[PDB]
Design an enzyme around this catalytic site. Structure first.
Site, short mmCIF file in Angstrom:
data_model
loop_
_atom_site.label_atom_id
_atom_site.label_comp_id
_atom_site.label_asym_id
_atom_site.label_seq_id
_atom_site.Cartn_x
_atom_site.Cartn_y
_atom_site.Cartn_z
CG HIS A 40 -0.49 0.41 2.58
ND1 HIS A 40 -0.08 -0.42 3.52
CD2 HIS A 40 -0.47 1.68 3.14
CE1 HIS A 40 0.19 0.25 4.61
NE2 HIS A 40 -0.05 1.52 4.37
CG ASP A 84 0.01 -3.72 2.90
OD1 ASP A 84 0.57 -3.25 1.92
OD2 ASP A 84 -0.21 -3.02 3.87
N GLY A 175 2.24 7.14 8.54
CA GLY A 175 3.60 7.46 8.19
C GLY A 175 4.58 6.40 8.68
CB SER A 177 2.48 2.71 6.08
OG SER A 177 1.14 2.72 6.52
N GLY A 178 4.71 0.33 6.20
CA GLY A 178 5.83 -0.28 5.51
C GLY A 178 7.03 -0.64 6.40
N1 LIG Z 1 -2.26 1.95 14.40
C1 LIG Z 1 -1.99 1.24 13.17
C2 LIG Z 1 -1.50 2.16 12.07
C3 LIG Z 1 -2.64 2.91 11.45
C4 LIG Z 1 -2.15 3.87 10.38
C5 LIG Z 1 -1.41 3.09 9.27
C6 LIG Z 1 -0.29 2.21 9.83
C7 LIG Z 1 -0.85 1.36 10.98
#
Ligand SMILES: [NH3+]CC1CCCCC1
Ligand SMILES: [Ca+2]
Length: 223
Positions: A40, A84, A175, A177-178
């Site tokens: 994503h 993902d 932020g 993420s990944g």
């Molecule tokens: N609290 C989990 C987070 C939500 C925002 C995106 C990454 C994961």
């Protein structure tokens, strides 16, 4: 990261920042030429930033390498976020040292109760916004699969796990993420999704990396 602590400069040496003119996602260095992140987070024109602590200041340990190829998991579903995960190949190999290092892939899936380290440059507030410029760290346990399916009825597949706290207050956030979830010196998860951040009974949900080890290996052996 919400309710975490400042990691300290280059103490998480496998952490990368994916940059497209600004930081938009974290990632993990798995060998000198390949990064794994969340599908994503896919974008064209990714520059990988290694050796970062303050992402707005050049401090001296950085390596900025552009991506030559990105490979999203062939079964990634952006609606459910199942599978993902994405691989990114660097145009040239990173120079590996004590501050820029790769993280090992798992030979075994981690169990519920295992304490792990989640890190990233994402939002530090669960209500409102504040982005840190230095890397933030959080220690959190892997949650049991049944408490995970209870918090997210009908949404958890076998390729996901929950990690964090059902009381909330501490979590990854936007932020982040990944980014990596490292347990016992192995990459076990990728920061994937959740319902808001640090909310009660809404823990972070992470891609279960041990399920993807042979796809990762075969894909980097051929690309
Ligand atoms: N609290 C989990 C987070 C939500 C925002 C995106 C990454 C994961
Ligand atoms: Ca920097």
């Amino acid at each position: 990261i919400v309710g975490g602590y400042t990691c300290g400069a280059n103490t998480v040496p496998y952490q990368v920042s994916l940059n497209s003119g600004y930081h938009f996602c974290g990632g993990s260095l798995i060998n000198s030429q390949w990064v794994v992140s969340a599908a994503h987070c896919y974008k064209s024109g990714i520059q990988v930033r290694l050796g970062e602590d303050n992402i707005n200041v050049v401090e001296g340990n950085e390596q900025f390498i552009s991506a030559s190829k990105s490979i999203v998991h062939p079964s990634y579903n952006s609606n459910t976020l199942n599978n993902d995960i994405m691989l990114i190949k660097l145009k040239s190999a990173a120079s590996l040292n004590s501050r820029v290092a790769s993280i090992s892939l798992p030979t075994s899936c981690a169990s519920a109760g295992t304490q792990c380290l989640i890190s990233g440059w994402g939002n530090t507030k669960s209500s409102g916004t504040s982005y840190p410029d230095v890397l933030k760290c959080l220690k959190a346990p892997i949650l049991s699969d049944s408490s995970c399916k209870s918090a997210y009825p009908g949404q958890i597949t076998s390729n996901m796990f929950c990690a964090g706290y059902l009381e909330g207050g501490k979590d990854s956030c936007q932020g982040d993420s990944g980014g990596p979830v490292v347990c016992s010196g192995k990459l076990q998860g990728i920061v994937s999704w959740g319902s808001g951040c640090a909310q009660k009974n809404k823990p972070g949900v992470y891609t279960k990396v041990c399920n993807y080890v042979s796809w990762i290996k075969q894909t980097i052996a051929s690309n």
